Amino acid sequence: AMDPEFMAEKPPPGLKAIIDHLGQVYPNQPNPLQVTTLLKYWLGGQDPLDYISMYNYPGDVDRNVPPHWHYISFGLSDLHGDERVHLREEGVTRSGMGFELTFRLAKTEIELKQQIENPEKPQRPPTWPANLLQAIGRYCFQTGNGLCFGDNIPWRKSLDGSTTSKLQNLLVAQDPQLGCIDTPTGTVDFCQIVGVFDDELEQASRWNGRGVLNFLRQDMQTGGDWLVTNMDRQMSVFELFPETLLNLQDDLEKQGSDLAGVNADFTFRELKPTKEVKEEVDFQALSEKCANDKREEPSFPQSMSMSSNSLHKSCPLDFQAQAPNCISLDGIEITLAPGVAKYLLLAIKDRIRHGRHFTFKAQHLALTLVAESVTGSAVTVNEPYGVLGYWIQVLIPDELVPRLMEDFCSAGLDEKCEPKERLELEWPDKNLKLIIDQPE
Template sequence: MADIDRLQCRNIPMNFLPPTPPGLEALYLACRRIYPDQPNPLQVAALVKYWLGGPDPLDYISMYANPGDVELDIPPHWHYISFGLSDLHGDGRVHEVTGPETPSGFGFELTFRLRREASETAPPTWPATLMQSLAKYVFQSGNTLCAGDHVSWHCALDNSESRIQHILMAADAQLTTTTTPFGPVSFVQVVGICKEELLAAQRWNGPGVLDILKRLPVAGGAWLVTDMRRGENILELDPAAQEEVDRGIEEDGSNLSGVSARCSWSEFNQLFTPGESGGLATPPLSPHSDSEQIQAALKKGSLNTRPVLPPIKGQAERH
């Protein structure tokens, strides 16, 4: 509505459509390569854009009908693709403006593949809510999501009685890293998993569990399609999977030994300048000192008793 009001104030005809932002157009082009017969897919759009004060970081989530692949035993499914974690506009309204050689925005967009029921004629919209929640975590924490990460969600992704209550992140099977005017963008797929699969990822690693999911069509298959009706975990579907996980834990251990951190520092020009008494001068205090930041964080934490998301664990090689 704000965009329409702005156009009216400028006496621009109502049938005038503003050009698609360059970053968004580059992502649309990547989608059209996979879905040339769906130039105008159904979309879930933020009513008030994030850069206009709205609560949802993702401007759009497109929903494509994917026919699957009979030869690969991939079932028909809905393919959800987000737009907003990367820099769509390149003018600083959401993300810091960077050069084309650095990642665009957070450097990735989210995708999700949901098994299509035979009776469905339109895609469910609950995955869009799930993706918005994950995007809020990224924007609020500054932490990115990478293939192999896991999210402890602790409830059915669609709020049903499903056993699919947690998440693994994977590289999208069809959408590869795309070059945009504002930097490269990768596509990280949300994969629904059971509690037992989450524990295996925690005790071993995410990529290992993803490999098992990929070779079991019922559990996701090569394209990691989430089936909310799945009632068996990988250890029940494949008796050899337990041995593989145990061997991986014994040989590789767990890769949950790292933490994500954001560091910054500043230079004090007078750090080694002699003071009036002959000693070293005390460097000037920053108006936003570490102690003030810690106190503010503690105060905020004491007031916020309901986190936006459960803890998200990363891989050990990330710093």
Template sequence: MDEAASLPHGPPMNILPPTPAGLESLYALCRKIYPDQVNPLQVTALLKYWLGGPDPLDYVSMYSNPGAPHENIPPHWHYISFGLSDLHGDGRVHDVSGPEGVSGFGFELTFRLRREPGETEPPTWPATLMQSLAKYVFQSGNTLCSRDHVTWHCALDNSESRIQHMLMTTDIQLKTAHTPFGSVEFIQIVGICAEELKAAQQWNGAGILDMITRIPADGNRTGSSKASWRSMAHNGHAEGGKAYSNWTSMRRKKSKEVSELGGSSLSGVSARCSWAEQDASNVDIAHLKDKSDENNEDLKLKSRVHQSLQGNQSALESAELVHVKKLEGVHLIFNLEAGSLLPLAIRGRVKHGRHFTFESILGETAITLVAHSVTGTLVDSNILSLPKVPGCKY
């Protein structure tokens, strides 16, 4: 018998499985921006999340971006996540959606890091940071949007850098992708220092991002550019000079002036908080202190940003009020960081006729401070009222 005749005939078998449709759509967008980097370096989850692994992101691709000298943007590494959106479309991670819907959580993360002279391989710490943020999203169900902020309280690269917090913005190159399983926005992480975080909370993230765009790449001269380095990427070296300090002082003064005039666009945060009805005539101060100490542990706060500052009216989601209970006193408990935002909630929101909500990360609890002008609520300056809404715990 002819040996060749015993071999199977037909097209050669593809050893590698096909790329999932959602992932391929995102890869195609990346190839348009980086046509000469079809196989970029990747950080890969060894055991995929849908197989019981700890890391929600299947991949983080790392591209070499040449920068744009005419826009004051040096060469840098461009990190792009894959996993917050629906890559597979078969329900293994996310609920299945069609092309007209939202894919997974509706976004992927990006990050940009200055490429040092002679550097041939990208550092991997940004991928670790992105995995940490992805874990927060999967565990809490809270998505990250442009102009949100995230407090971190340690250098993003575990160095001595003062850039220890994050603002979110739309990635100016990737923007939005359309996949068979829905749309995907690309949200870029921008590192900020404590002063910039406070300014973003007192005013709004968009205003601080606009001010950041005016910081030049070298940190040693003033002026503005179409797309500055700080708005594009993480740069720990631009923060130590006198010019940077001057810019920070100017931004703090400007944001304070604007927030006093127009209020803050920050309408709420995810926090560790709770409440209980309290007899105003019998408050155990020592008990309150003990409870406060229990909740002083560090917490990553993610903002929920009100989309407009137009007008003085602000509305809460309406719900049928079935019962209103008048309380003599309320005992509120916040972790340290959430409590530090109370002056902002009162001066930057309630004073301007708006609301501010602390939403508990531990359960279905929300504490909302409201002004009498906020529609859909019952507010009396002499009576503390608590609307009882079906299905909600306050």
């Protein structure tokens, strides 16, 4: 059940519109169980969701839909429009963060006996998902990370806080009943939250969310058509149907990856034969300058996830220096911690090959790999290596992709690999060296 210390139980333009659209979707249920916060967010509270509606879905096995409870949140979208939670720039079309969380929780067989069999007195939904929904609402607000259809939410805890449930992580889908609605405060996506296994999460991150969700839609055992979460699920979709692993390969080779980047311990240095390496291209110097001197903007790597195509109006940095030029490097030696070596293959085979970019972000500086057809970069074929303030950019030409993939295999860089040895890789014709090892 919900935490009683925080939650219990003309109207605002955002509230009225959502509740009216919900009226359309649920005509038999005009007064559903609704929960609210004791201390609202605009009054100092930690909890961003003002209300959580809880609907009773009886079931419909003809379509692939089990009996379940449907949860809808009010708070992430702009409900009031008077600048009490969400800012209005007057140029934005989204209402607040532009969406509201929905959750579909399968009824347990214990609850199912009551529905038809044991008694026909009113069946009140379980309230525990209120805790779950607030928690990810806090996540959204504190990171600035809005949710898109196919997004993942790394989450390393059973959604109910139990010791029995194997579902630890979250995927984001389109709600099959609620779509996107126009409100007087802007637009509202309906982002359905879906509980998943660890391997199901990794695959969505390395490939794409929609593809994993499509596997989960295929059978009742995995959520059915409307992606219903069952907290008793024993096996992942790849364990139950090993067929889907094969289909994943087919479409990974064709579609590539949606993963824009990783937090990664790395270092770079200029491979220069002629003059003096200045302070503006030195890792240690630049990192010291960067260190010296709720959330409106998304954070890494969601900030880089909008355009896999372009680097325009996007930056992998929290704070960026004023840098008038891209300072061109004659050569570059990249040192990469072995823990993230499993992302180079991903970078080249799944991003650069498809005309996309991939960013390795360290403590202060960021390294981005770039394909020839990526726009908005400070880097060119003739000058492929550059440092733009605290942002390093490295061009990888199409001709170099097959060479990089080939050499990665010989070194044994797999999706699962973690080199216990020091690895030196070089391409002298391109003035590019890669070292798999711990920095300094």
